[PDB]
Design a binder for this molecule. Sequence first.
Ligand SMILES: Cc1ncc(COP(=O)(O)O)c(CNC(CN)CCC(=O)O)c1O
Ligand SMILES: *Cc1c(COP(=O)(O)O)cnc(C)c1O
Ligand SMILES: NC[C@@H](N)CCC(=O)O
Lengths: 427, 427
Amino acid sequence: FKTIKSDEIFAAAQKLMPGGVSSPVRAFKSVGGQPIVFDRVKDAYAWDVDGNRYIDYVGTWGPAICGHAHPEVIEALKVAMEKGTSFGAPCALENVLAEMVNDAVPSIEMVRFVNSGTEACMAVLRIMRAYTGRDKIIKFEGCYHGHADMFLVKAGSGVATLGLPSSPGVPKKTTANTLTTPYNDLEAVKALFAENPGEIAGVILEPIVGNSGFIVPDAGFLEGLREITLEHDALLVFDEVMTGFRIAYGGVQEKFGVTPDLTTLGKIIGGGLPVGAYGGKREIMQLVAPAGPMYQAGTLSGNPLAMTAGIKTLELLRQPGTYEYLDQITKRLSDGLLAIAQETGHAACGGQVSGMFGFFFTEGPVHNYEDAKKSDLQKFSRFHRGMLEQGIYLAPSQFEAGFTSLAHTEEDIDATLAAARTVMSAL
Amino acid sequence: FKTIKSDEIFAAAQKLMPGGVSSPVRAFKSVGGQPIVFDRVKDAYAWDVDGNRYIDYVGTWGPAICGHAHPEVIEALKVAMEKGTSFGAPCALENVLAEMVNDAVPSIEMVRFVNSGTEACMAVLRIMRAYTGRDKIIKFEGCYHGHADMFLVKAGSGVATLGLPSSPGVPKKTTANTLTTPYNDLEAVKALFAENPGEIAGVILEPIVGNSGFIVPDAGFLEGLREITLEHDALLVFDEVMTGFRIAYGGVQEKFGVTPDLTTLGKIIGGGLPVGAYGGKREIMQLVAPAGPMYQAGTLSGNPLAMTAGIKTLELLRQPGTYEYLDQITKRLSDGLLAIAQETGHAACGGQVSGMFGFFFTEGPVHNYEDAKKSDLQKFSRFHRGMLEQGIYLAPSQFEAGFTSLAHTEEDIDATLAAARTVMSAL
Ligand SMILES: Cc1ncc(COP(=O)(O)O)c(CNC(CN)CCC(=O)O)c1O
Ligand SMILES: *Cc1c(COP(=O)(O)O)cnc(C)c1O
Ligand SMILES: NC[C@@H](N)CCC(=O)O
């Protein structure tokens, strides 16, 4: 196993971009510091610049639920780029997708497209405040909603992986209106409303965590966040950027039957292109310009290509057996992964909901960021590098949920299980 | 001239999205409402859903400097999407583009890609503050850097340092550190530094305005913004999202020989895909994660499709005669447009630089937003609708710069001039 060519390229990138990457995590710091450069991806696999093949479990971080470079998605894209890659004006495709999204997500009866999760989240945070008139907001430690000032305090992803604290470059005045609290803790939330009466606009959270490792809500937690927000006439926001169209067609809100006021989307609806969206309760969206006073703009927003990738992606996902298959194989890997660690005598706790899972080096049980932080990071490091050499590509971080796609076969699951047994055995 | 099909579609979008558009301007509210829905675009033209053909001067708002659906750009894209539309990891293409961007823009010796102008500007704003440690920022009335909350500050005499939020949903605390002032006003800037000693991190601006109509800097203004910032050891930031690779290969900073500390890019470097970038002075970028402590990350940032469209786009722009041709025809349209208004007897002014121009229905001359606000909007409204019927597509706003592409022929310019004479004549 060699990565000479990746090493060369990455060494050069460090002189061209910050950390030689376009996003922090890709740096591998928290797992070695030697990231691998990709050349192509197909179905459930990824290929080195050194020619190494991998069974990918990162799926470009969520977008590839139908598999990498899906035949029908690419075809729909080629045909589409013939008519232009961007108009900067209205097009029929926006309507189609808007419609599909409305039909898909319950709380969503009116949506607005953007270009990334960060845009959606910073805009939903604004509408959150514009509608209610209150400045303060409540988020959970470990959760992630993009690199927007307000959210940069007890964030997730990279800042929740390789050290990294709140700020810097964010005025204290900013993060002041942001109330943080431990995940899966209704009481902690109930207190934040008491300490700040009439000041909390609403609560935002990942209906299921993926930015602190895989973390699912406890019984009555979501149901509870819905009761307390209503009680204080405050909004409940679901950041389904990662979970949207993955945990279920209608996201976590459809699967666990909890309807929020507003919800953010991204990743999967882009089918592999930069796309985002924030929508929901009609009467709240009307505040969005040019319908309402809340200004929010985007230049490449609703562009033909992205609207096409998304249309085609949701269409593939409407096929029968989609989610059933995903949960089927995802259950095999998780159970099998925790089964293997138990045999090699390594403390670990996993879990999964559909084609999304988690695997912490700590027995748990994990309910919040703190619990998750007990993971043996030095272990995961050796484990991650291990899998890599065995031909398995996993998120270069302990605090990142795992993903599967419709392109992952029963064999891939078994092959991943094999390599895992090999790696852990020598851990 | 009919737009029944566009009316139908837009009527439906208003029930699906806020204002029935993905971005405010698209709603045509400042031109009498009722926008036109596109179906396809090729070279310098655009086509209705009703079949109407137009000589487009919006160019999807900047990205199409090589023309709509450029043959070599599309070909480079198809070939590329075969290897995947997004990896979520490092790839050789990021290095290529980063390199090209570094060679291109002077101030830029290290860059970071993002997905839109808004991401670049909000991140450059953060790095601006993180490097200097100061919270306050100075921008100009009329300029635009995206809907990031701090830029959603009310501008105009009587409220410069009042930092009042010109949009609901954004707290007062945030815009409080946003000091504003009239474009092309060195003294107004010199005062802001006196009233706020040691608190101003830097100045951000459009090296050439495009978001208040076309507005170019007066002699010594940019050179001046560079002296005063150095004097107070503060950063000078050039938002070249619109101007980058359009006013010149190296943007305004190369053409007018003024080098800033940091500079934002977008639009053209995406070749028609959602792309963004903020870079510059090496020692300042190192603060960007994972190199430094400031956090910023994007899931799609650095995706191969966008990196490919951008690579190919800059390559076409490196050909000989590129900018010379652009300035050649853009000069023909501007001069000819002002020549026509003079004849029809219309109060008008404006001009052009490379493939960017402006046209105000006022005697001016124009040096800032106020000056520009004197434009007869009711006139532009009838003028805009007029051009539309004659087969010309212009930005549905008086405060938006005009654009041309390498795909615009001498004939197109002459035909636009023709329709203009026709329209103004009956204005
Ligand atoms: C100098 C400058 N800086 C930042 C931006 C914001 O870029 P985007 O986030 O919207 O890609 C822009 C955006 N420009 C336009 C068209 N003039 C946005 C399109 C719209 O608002 O409809 C800009 O001109
Ligand atoms: C991935 C993620 C984001 C970040 O979205 P970007 O497009 O990278 O800005 C935001 N929220 C959640 C829940 C995510 O998983
Ligand atoms: N939950 C965080 C990841 N989607 C990170 C994606 C990236 O930055 O590339």
